[PDB]
């Protein structure tokens, strides 16, 4: 989408935050995506990981005729209707996983949109501007779900609209 | 397949009778040491003196289980093979139950020499269910199960 | 959704009544419950409502002392118990579950939907 | 296409008071074929079809 | 996702509306969301829902050897497959259906803002904050699809911004 | 679906811009996001689109019975399972085709709405209002990436706002 | 896309005249038909419009009481009927597509796509 590249410094988790303020720049994940990311790709995993005992002969060593070759028949058959359903089911199972994780990337990024409301915009790489002093404590809060709007609403509005 | 199935080679020995014929016959192609021996789980019946007679045994189920016999059919070399082991010129082994029956007619001709013998067994095996009974009757070329499985 | 209540009881004065009323069809304990006095010939008094996971409870500054209702999450019934009886306690006793409206984050009124029978206490020597 | 089938003389159990068996054959005969049936003996006919 | 939780109160739709004005609250349904998921999911479920006459033996009262172990092994194999169909169907229809759901409610929402323009702002939380008068009529003008965001644009703007 | 209808007039591509302004209407459609789409399609139809030789008889000219029947259940259960198999995938193969281009639809509305920042408003049909002098080479450059908001935006937020 | 013709007509002096224009390559319901006359040497005059789906039709004020626009959806052929021939209406019939120019909820102009081949019709004794 929006966002371009991923960051190779983050080894502490899939998805996060990066800042840059006053006092400096910063980066941090957040493990509540991460976490629910990880949940569904090792769910998805424990779905796809049968005892059959006597079988029919898969290999001969004599020309018989009519047995012999419906037995292959039957076997070849078999295998290729299950390499069919291989092929699908890790196709299928690829597909969502990506689009799974690109859901979580965008679900993080309009919960912080609508924890900021009127005091921050969007500027189309993912990333946002804030309109107002937002100190390190302030990131934090905006990371951990505690941000209030209303006390930074008059100057993010004032440096918004009036130049 | 019906043995490897079955997962058991348990053979019980059972006091079949053969009156008028000659038991525990043996070939040199099954040396069993220095003397000539034979498969274990089977009899090879032959002439006793100069006469074969008509061989009719029975054997009932009064188990709860089912039991397999395999019995074989000797295909001697020649004719005087034949008649230097059976009397009969031509012999014949039919083994039935009550639901199924299976006659063998023995072939004479020269196969090729295997283990220094040129004649053929044709092993055949039979099924007796609980109720059921096994009667063997040949006139002659009858290798005669010891048991079953 | 029905609240079933237990039967009429005719206790003596100077003594307590328990009512029963038993859940069916809503998990019982995700609602508040709430038990109404309806006195023969006049309007409904509110009593109280017990907070049917952690069985806190808040009752009417008038039966303070008196009222002490308990849950039962096992077999989803609300019980009322009001001691001292007294004549003017004869009435019609409901159980009514609060439904909270919520607008979001917050809360803004309700109703009570649904309610039981009602049992009809008695006082008398 | 043809059946030829052998009888063979034994002591099968005694069923309903027979020792002796009677195995069952069948034969198709297309538009524009002929049945010939040929026995020197032991034959159990047909007495028409199906 | 940003709602929270259902209501057990709404019996008369699948999705709807709830509001507080100096009147007091109200809840009522949507239909046209309701009634696109009722035939999303009935156009899938006749599609879920074969004639042989006659067929091979498949249960055996003896032991007879290749062709009774031929038979019993195309059983197994036919079994096994359909087994295997059945479960992915069911799987992949579910997903659909809770996805298809989903999308339902967020098409609701994003109709509904942007039918109030600049005259809400987005509490994150499914619900919006109508800064302005909006009386009984004025819901049921943003319900049934015709709000007129001009009418009120001076006072909503002269409440959002300036204080 | 907030977009009502297509345009039968734009045979140059998939999705594309129009636009009016104080010299006339044009029309100009998108190249990136069509070559997206196309990309995707032809991926998904390259793999849609085996080698026996010696395989069992089909058709037979006499009764026979065990072996017959067991010839002609094997190959009805292969060719009612490869039905099924067929029409899943198209199903599937369908479902994600209309999904991939709404999506890719939602990109470019996006994209734009992300690019005019607060210098546009979005009326609702699935297009936006510019609230400032917006000439040709105003149009191009929202369409090509290169456009430029600080340079309106102050006749863009006294036009949005004060009246 | 294309629109078909009639062939052309040696009519005489008051007189009526149909010219017949068939629709292949879309929904000939779904778009408007305009008809334009082009004298011999002289410029376009556009006569009037016909809506496929409706039946309404819309005129100039100079035509007024002299034509008439049908449709058949059938066969996807729109008709012009014009009375009170004179030497005068000898020109070039042309029976054109309206596309209009949809921006959202309001339309802004268009333009005249595909063009038919036109007709000749001739007024002499």
């Known amino acids: 989408g929006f966002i371009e590249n991923g960051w190779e410094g983050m080894i502490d988790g899939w998805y996060g935050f990066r800042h840059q303020n006053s006092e400096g720049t910063g980066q941090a994940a957040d493990l509540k995506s991460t976490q629910a990311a990880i949940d569904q790709i090792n769910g998805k995993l424990n779905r796809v990981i049968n005892e059959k005992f006597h079988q029919i002969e898969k290999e001969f060593s004599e020309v018989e005729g009519r047995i012999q070759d419906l037995e292959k028949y039957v076997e070849d058959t078999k295998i290729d209707l299950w390499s069919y359903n291989a092929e699908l089911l890790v196709a299928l199972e690829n597909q969502h996983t990506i689009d799974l994780t690109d859901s979580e990337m965008n679900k993080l990024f309009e919960k912080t949109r609508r924890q900021l409301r009127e005091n921050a915009e969007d500027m189309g790489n993912g990333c946002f501007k804030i309109y107002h002093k937002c100190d390190n404590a302030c990131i934090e809060s905006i990371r951990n779900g505690t941000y209030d709007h209303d006390i930074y609403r008059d100057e993010a509005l004032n440096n918004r609209f009036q130049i | 397949s019906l043995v490897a199935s079955s997962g058991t080679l348990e053979f019980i020995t059972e006091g079949f009778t053969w009156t008028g014929v000659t038991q525990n016959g043996g070939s040199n192609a099954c040396k069993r040491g220095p003397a000539s021996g034979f498969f274990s789980r089977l009899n090879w019946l032959t002439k006793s003196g100069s006469a074969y007679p008509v061989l009719n045994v029975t054997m009932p189920n009064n188990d709860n289980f089912d039991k397999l016999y395999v019995w074989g059919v000797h295909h001697p070399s020649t004719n005087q093979e034949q008649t230097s082991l059976y009397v009969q010129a031509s012999g014949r082994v039919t083994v039935s139950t009550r639901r199924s029956q299976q006659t063998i007619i023995p072939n004479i001709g020269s196969r090729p020499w295997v283990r220094g013998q040129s004649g053929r067994i044709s092993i055949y095996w039979t099924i007796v269910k609980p109720g059921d009974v096994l009667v063997i009757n040949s006139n002659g070329n009858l290798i005669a199960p010891r048991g079953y499985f | 959704v029905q609240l079933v209540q237990s039967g009429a009881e005719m206790k003596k004065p100077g003594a307590s009544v328990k009512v029963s009323c038993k859940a069916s069809?809503?998990?019982?304990?995700?609602?508040?419950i709430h038990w109404v006095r309806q006195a023969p010939g006049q309007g409904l008094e509110w009593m109280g409502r017990?907070?049917?996971?952690?069985?806190?409870?808040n009752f009417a500054q008038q039966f303070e002392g008196r009222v002490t209702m308990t849950r039962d999450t096992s077999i989803s019934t609300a019980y009322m118990e009001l001691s001292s009886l007294r004549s003017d306690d004869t009435a019609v006793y409901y159980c009514?579950?609060?439904?909270?409206?919520?607008?979001?984050?917050?809360?803004?009124?309700?109703?009570?939907?649904?309610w039981g029978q009602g049992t009809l206490v008695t006082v008398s020597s | 296409s043809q059946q030829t089938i052998i009888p063979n003389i034994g002591s099968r159990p005694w069923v309903r008071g027979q020792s002796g068996r009677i195995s069952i054959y069948w034969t198709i005969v297309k538009p524009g074929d002929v049945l010939v049936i040929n026995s020197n003996g032991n034959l159990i006919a047909p007495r028409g079809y199906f | 996702g940003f709602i929270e939780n259902g209501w057990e109160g709404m019996i008369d739709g699948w999705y709807g509306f709830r509001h507080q004005n100096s009147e007091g609250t109200g809840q009522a349904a949507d239909l046209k969301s309701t009634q696109a998921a009722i035939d999303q999911i009935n156009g899938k479920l006749n599609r879920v829902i074969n004639e042989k006459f006659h067929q091979i033996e498949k249960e055996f009262s003896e032991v007879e050897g290749r062709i009774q172990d031929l038979e019993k092994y195309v059983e197994d194999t036919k079994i096994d497959l359909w087994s295997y169909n059945a479960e992915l169907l069911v799987a992949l229809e579910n997903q659909h259906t809770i996805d298809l759901t989903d999308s339902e409610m967020n098409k609701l929402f994003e109709k509904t803002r942007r039918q109030l323009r600049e005259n809400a702002e987005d509490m994150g939380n499914g619900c919006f904050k109508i800064y302005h008068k909006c009386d009984n009529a004025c819901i049921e003008s943003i319900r049934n699809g015709t709000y007129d965001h001009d009418i009120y644009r001076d006072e909503a703007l002269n409440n959002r911004f300036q204080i | 679906g907030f977009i009502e209808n297509g345009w039968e007039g734009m045979i140059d591509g998939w999705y594309g811009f129009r636009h009016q302004n104080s010299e006339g209407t044009g029309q100009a459609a998108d190249l990136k996001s069509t070559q997206a789409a196309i990309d995707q399609i032809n991926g998904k139809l390259n793999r849609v689109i085996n080698e026996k030789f010696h395989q069992i008889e089909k058709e037979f000219s006499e009764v026979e019975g065990r072996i017959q029947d067991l010839e002609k259940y094997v190959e009805d259960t292969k060719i009612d399972l490869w039905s099924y198999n067929a029409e899943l995938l198209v199903a599937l193969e369908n479902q994600h085709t209309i999904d991939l281009t709404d999506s890719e639809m939602n990109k470019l509305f996006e994209k734009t709405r992300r690019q005019l920042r607060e210098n546009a408003e979005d009326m609702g049909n699935g297009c936006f209002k510019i609230y400032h002098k917006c000439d040709n080479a105003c149009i191009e450059s929202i369409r090509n990436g290169t456009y430029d908001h600080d340079i309106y935006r102050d006749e863009a937020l006294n036009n949005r706002f004060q009246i | 896309v294309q629109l078909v013709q009639s062939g052309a007509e040696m009519k005489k002096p008051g007189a009526s005249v149909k010219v017949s224009c068939?629709?292949?390559?879309?929904?000939?319901?779904?778009?408007?038909?305009?008809?334009v006359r082009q004298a011999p040497g002289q410029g376009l005059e556009w006569?009037?419009?016909?809506?496929?789906?409706?039946?309404?039709?819309?005129?100039?004020q100079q035509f007024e009481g002299r034509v008439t626009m049908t449709r058949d959806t059938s066969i996807s052929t729109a008709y012009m009927e014009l009375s009170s021939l004179r030497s005068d209406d000898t020109a070039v019939?042309?029976?054109?597509?309206?596309?209009?120019?949809?921006?959202?909820?309001?339309?802004?102009?268009?333009?005249?796509?595909?063009?038919?081949?036109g007709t000749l019709v001739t007024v002499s004794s």
């Open positions: 069809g809503y998990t019982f304990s995700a609602y508040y």
């Open positions: 017990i907070n049917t996971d952690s069985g806190g409870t």
């Open positions: 009514a579950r609060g439904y909270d409206f919520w607008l979001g984050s917050y809360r803004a009124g309700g109703w009570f939907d649904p």
